[PDB]
Symmetry: D2
Subunit: 504 residues, 4 copies
């Protein structure tokens, strides 16, 4: 007899577990509980703040929602018009001293003429090959080259992706990319070159919403707050230390035992394996490759420079900086950094030299968020990475040597990306059915280890669907058919379904 | 205020309506009711019987279940081992005097050598073109010719499909077929010709189940039998005569009114427009094309002939018989026809002549069911179709001139197939969303007018998923993505889900 | 017996006949004679001069020799360095107010950008189809669209060729073009577009030679001058009126009869049929299509304008002028027009009005030559063509309205181009072998009616090779395999061969 | 001054030199002379006979004339209808116990079904690749596999050609083959399979002409006999020992020196370089690959066996015999072997055992001629090759173990085939121009070293055209454009041209 008994136990209150909890709470049928070792809900979608008052999120991939249900929950959580700011999806690729609007291939008119020739030639080759193709690419790398041709592939996607995944593109599968044909739009590319134009893939239609306060972490705090407090257990009192799969009981730090009929686990699956003391799974989960992510934050004194402007996120294929992506985080909300009247001293200049004085001066302020990837194939010196990022900012002309840095931030996330390697699926098809046979739904970024559904909306929906499968027999579409869900409007599932309308 | 009020009203107690009802009954949340103008549930999945005791179903497309949910409901309806018989999926194409195992192209070694050359040459052309193809086929005919080449198309698919659909293949779309690339397996086809091999797509693992009694109609009577009687209204008492979609009320023939919050309608959508008195929808629904089906049944005296053997269904591309498909219905269950000891006089010989006497002789008996299609592009003379079918049986060597016929059956089903025309989707996108905007889920073979989800398992699930959409916010996967549901094991939805397991605690 | 007998009789003293004469004279074996109705040798390669002293040739296709034999004869005829001028092969296409260097597709960077997009889009389509092509184009038009794509084909080659041939491109064969594959060089075109580059297909090693004096006519007068005069019959005394192919005799205007063993006829083959009184050949030769060519010459007062500069020939696809090609004939030689000190009055201004002064004034002078085509499919107004040409010169900005015209020239050549129609070969494989069996070698621009071997170097060698076939059993390579002769260095046949060398010792 | 002076000197009296001399004699203009070290004209187209009375030619490639001129000289040399026998071009490939009619691929219905499947499958692959091909094959091997597909290539053309050329197919060029596209006729091949049909490429109009007497050797003796005897020097008196390219003189073995203005040399070009004492040319010519050919003749007692019948020549891809080609030489003329009444003892039985008696018995007789190739890459044991050939005859069921052999013949021709290696052209376009610059027309099988024009008709015409080039400025079409001459009817040049008609 365990100390607590519930039908459905949810481990983890990141977006995945919150998704499961939200759906359980709406269904209000089977009994349930959600636990997490952190007092603040949000998991890795939480937001940090420096002593100087600069917020930083864990990533630069803004929200794009594929589901009405996700929208319902975000809207319930933060219902006021002024709870959000809307922006156009503005991004550029840093290449040869130029900010090239995304998508790269549609904007190579900014490159020197001879390089345009090399690019067009390679894409001509790719189009002619795609005309008689009778096989599908097998690696991320083959997919890139079939889409872009050699010249364009070498300038951006190949070196960029190495910096993103910390593995070569030849080591990765390409199913996670979706099912689009690996072929160039040669006319679109020659057309912009001939017309000598540039054009980003953004406009009034292509927008994202960012929360006015508390970063992305603020979304998840407000979602979590809609849950019945008594069904949550957050903090040390909720840290799971053992999972006894055969007896269907969990044991917490404080010794509390919880019995369950079904388990939704959102912890990394390698940690779950260890927690189950299941040696066969420990071996299998150790085969799952992943990269570690360093997030660097830099707060800068001054009004937003013209050269930065309305830029949102930026891609860096080149080797003159260690980060793959930068975000102008101060463009997302005026509350991601201190107000202009707030007074801070300069810590250092961008060229690394001491400020003229140590006196606190006022703002306004702007803020940059940088991402760097580490793996066995790509080491990162944690002792120098901050300074290398800052020099990277100078090298890319994001900061003048004279810019005044008033805040710095560095954090290393051991589990950063679950890598879409060639071996991933072969390993996961061994791991997930074994857990499934024990009534354990292991789901989430590292819960199910599939990158393509490991961001916020998809993960939230992994949790939702896991519960919908457990209770209503729904297909888990997002877990197993990401292309299917991505290719459509998912409007059927709502925070208020027929069931609740008829019950009231 | 109306006489009766329910959250969800279902019109029709064919497989689709019964599906909706089963799901509503399992969930047992929103109130609901199911009405049908017929006293006997099962809709067009019902079974007829001749005065002589021969059973006939409405078609020859046997059950293949794509869903565990469907299996749960059939098994619950008919749980005994002896409620079913299992048969291998044995089918052949009648061609130039031969029974050619299906699939046709893998078995052309049975044809004359010169015909094999023509077939292979055609498939070589199609392979060569498929190698540089940069577009998808737009019509059923283009699909057929790309898969099979001209020689093979002309012998089977083309003339056969005209006979099935009662429209030319050039008039049909090809999305309903699934997503498989239209290209020939040249190597497999030439390999079998070279080896002189024949090979049916059946075996110990390719089987179907058929109910021991009452034909397919017996399945749906038993499924309906599991519902609570007081939530059903079957017979003249349940005939819908008016649908007021703005009031969300329905009026029955006896004057009863039913208010609903959501309507699952499984009547033919063209009949729904009329019942709604919605002239806009009438206009649109009249643009939908359909064929009418004649089912002919023939009871024969004798032990099962050797030439017939274990054959299940048979295809007829050639123009020496009016039917496109025949079924040896007596092979499906010994209770589809009378016992050997039953005495029946001979009605006629297969060559059409009278028999000498009126003497009632004994069996055993075997039984053939034939299907013929009719449309405005292919009329059928109802007055001679029976005699034409019988002569077709003689032409195809299924019956000898002297075989003794002891029972005949003929019925015309006006809405037979909803035709997958080139125009169908354009029209449905104007119709179904307009109905949806009124909280009307029009679903079924003719409720939603998509052939590819219009047989028993799919239709049943259309009903189940419609309810799941209404109540649980489920995706209607079968309605909009038949290729998705047909390509996977649909095991998630069960007659007993977690919701029920947990609630009984 | 006839008045004169020779082994080989040659009719015509144009390039083709003179070629036959030259080879016969070099071999100096069989006896021979060459006749022509013009006292001045050179046939249609002759040069006219206006009363004001401007020379005009018959066309603007400059010499490119494919044969050392041809070079030998021109050099023997005009041996001095000062008998010739050398020029780079400079040409442009007039398009949308601009002079675009030939070849057109390599220079579209000159057109507006939105137009370059259409051109490249079209060539992209053509490159993609060329990748999977398994047929050869059947028509000039098909060949054009496969090489260039629709956009580019529409800007230059289609409308230009209609103006040149006076029949639609869809009505012509494409073998005469050579054997190069009809596919676009997409990379070269896009590369130039991207680099913003223009590039003409000329330079220090892409040049032509033009005679210093007397135009091309001067070459042929001088080549003829090397023949033994007693074997020539030029003038009214050499006009053939009758050919009796059965007797192998010819009758001249003055009643003189010439008997031959082998006849090399370079007159137009349709006229030959008539002279033969051969009704079957008359019928066959009338199936051959040809266009008529108008040559217009314009003499202009002024030093050569900068806008003209070193231009040699110029192409005009557009509608604003009736000519297809123009030639700055004064760039070819200072002796193609009068010296600066020559005094001539202005006949008219280029805008058509009368000049202010009737007074003779001095030069310098420059000179334009224009070509206009006409046929039954593309009629031309003969009465207005001169004025229309001059207005065309104003329309294309070659002349200013105020330019002073001091000389004009206009001549119509009835047989201008023998047209490479789809029908040409079928006809010629009846005509040529039929004459062949009479021992008549009918050769030349209209002798054998194949355009692609109808210019000076090729026609000359047609004559030479005919003789070499008659005497030495040589292959007639030029007549039957123009791609073969055009793709190689023809260095073997010389004005002094081993035969002459070994005999002189 | 030299002992003799002529305008054109021709060295060698094989088909190539006789062609040259024939054209010179027709033109009867410039003075000329033809020398050869052999008293009997005909070069390697000469014919040996065994002591027992069996004739053997040097090869089994029958005459197909591409020129009227050649026909004229053959007709003049041997004008009687009874000077020739005509026969259908009947050939077969020995494969897995069967005689398969040529062409092999239209006749694979004779092979086991499983093997038919593998063949058709490989040809399907080939047809599908040829549908999208945009390059030309670079090697003989690539050409074969693209025409036939893998299965068929491996059964016949690949192994057969190794035995022919004595070098692998991968090491040879493919321009010598002609300009036909490398693609399968898939429908013809599958059609004959489906119908169970066999069809050879012969019939009443696909015939060849063979000399009634003396073998091919009699053709050339007779041709030579039409030349003015005083213009020939054949035998020891005509052996060239030195060629002084610079003074244009030739020195013979007997000491006599001959001056020339133009030289037509038809000796092997590697010997010409040696005779010229030109070490630059020696070096180049030693880079030319060639194989050595062994010809084996077998004379057999008995009427022609039914199993042989009307077979003319036969191909042998398999390794149960050393020869690549066999010829039923007794089928070509009843005078290639002794009359039936001639008496000969049996020398051995086909299985290698002695005859029961050494008594001489009568015939009739039939005769087989075999070809074996030798090179650095494929050694032949000169001392056992004869016996191995005879065993090969038993292995291929051409002879029964009991067949009585009454005559044997074996001869090694050191210069057999000039091999169409990949390097050939690179080497030849250095060698011939240099000789041309010295007014030397080196022409012929080994004079110019191009196999594709090294048989009788082509070689003869090389000699004719060389003279026509020297005298009349003719193009040497056969030497430089063999596809051109092979694709047409060459009717223009005749033994009586206009120049001779008019000279009368």
């Amino acid at each position: 007899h365990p100390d607590i008994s519930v039908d459905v136990l949810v481990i983890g209150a990141g977006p995945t577990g919150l998704g499961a909890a939200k759906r359980l709470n709406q269904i209000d049928g089977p009994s349930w509980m959600i636990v997490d070792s952190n007092e603040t809900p949000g998991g890795l979608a939480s937001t940090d703040v420096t002593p100087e008052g600069f917020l930083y999120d864990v990533g630069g991939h803004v929200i794009f929602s594929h589901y009405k249900y996700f929208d319902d929950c975000l809207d319930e959580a933060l219902p006021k018009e002024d709870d959000w700011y809307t922006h156009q999806r503005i991004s550029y690729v840093r290449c040869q001293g130029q900010w090239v609007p995304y998508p790269f291939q549609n904007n190579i008119s900014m490159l020197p003429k001879e390089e345009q020739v090399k690019c067009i030639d390679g894409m001509i080759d790719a189009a002619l090959e795609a005309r008689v193709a009778n096989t599908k690419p097998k690696t991320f790398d083959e997919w890139i080259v079939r889409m872009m041709g050699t010249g364009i592939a070498d300038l951006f996607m190949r070196p960029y992706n190495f910096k993103v995944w910390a593995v070569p593109t030849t080591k990765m599968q390409c199913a996670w990319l979706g099912e689009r044909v690996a072929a160039p739009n040669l006319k679109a590319v020659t057309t912009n070159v001939i017309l000598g134009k540039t054009a980003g893939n953004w406009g009034p239609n292509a927008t994202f919403r960012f929360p006015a306060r508390g970063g992305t972490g603020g979304i998840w705090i407000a979602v979590a707050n809609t849950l019945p407090k008594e069904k949550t257990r957050f903090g040390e009192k909720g840290k799971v230390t053992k999972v006894n799969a055969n007896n269907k009981t969990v044991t917490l730090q404080d010794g509390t035992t919880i019995g369950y009929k079904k388990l939704v686990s959102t912890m990394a699956v390698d940690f779950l394996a260890e927690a189950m003391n299941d040696q066969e799974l420990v071996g299998l989960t150790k085969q799952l490759f992943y990269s570690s992510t360093h997030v660097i934050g830099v707060g800068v004194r001054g009004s937003r420079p013209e050269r930065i402007g309305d830029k949102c996120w930026l891609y860096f294929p080149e080797d003159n900086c260690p980060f793959y992506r930068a975000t102008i985080f101060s463009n997302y909300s005026p509350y991601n950094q201190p107000e202009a009247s707030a007074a801070l001293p300069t810590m250092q200049l961008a060229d690394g030299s001491r400020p003229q004085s140590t006196e606190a001066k006022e703002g306004p302020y702007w803020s940059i968020m940088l991402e760097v990837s580490e793996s066995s194939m790509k080491p990162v010196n944690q002792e120098t990475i901050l300074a290398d990022c800052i020099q990277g900012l100078v090298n890319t002309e994001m900061l003048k040597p004279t810019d005044e840095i008033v805040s710095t931030y560095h954090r290393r996330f051991d589990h950063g990306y679950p890598t879409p390697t060639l071996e991933r699926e072969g390993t996961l098809t061994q791991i997930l059915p074994k857990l499934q046979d024990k009534d354990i739904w292991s789901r989430g970024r590292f819960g199910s280890w599939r990158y393509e559904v490991g961001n916020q909306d998809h993960s939230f929906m992994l949790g939702v669907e896991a519960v919908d499968n457990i209770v209503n027999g729904a297909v888990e579409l997002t877990l197993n058919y990401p292309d299917f869900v991505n290719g459509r409007q998912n409007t059927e599932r709502r925070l208020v379904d027929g069931a609740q309308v008829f019950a009231k």
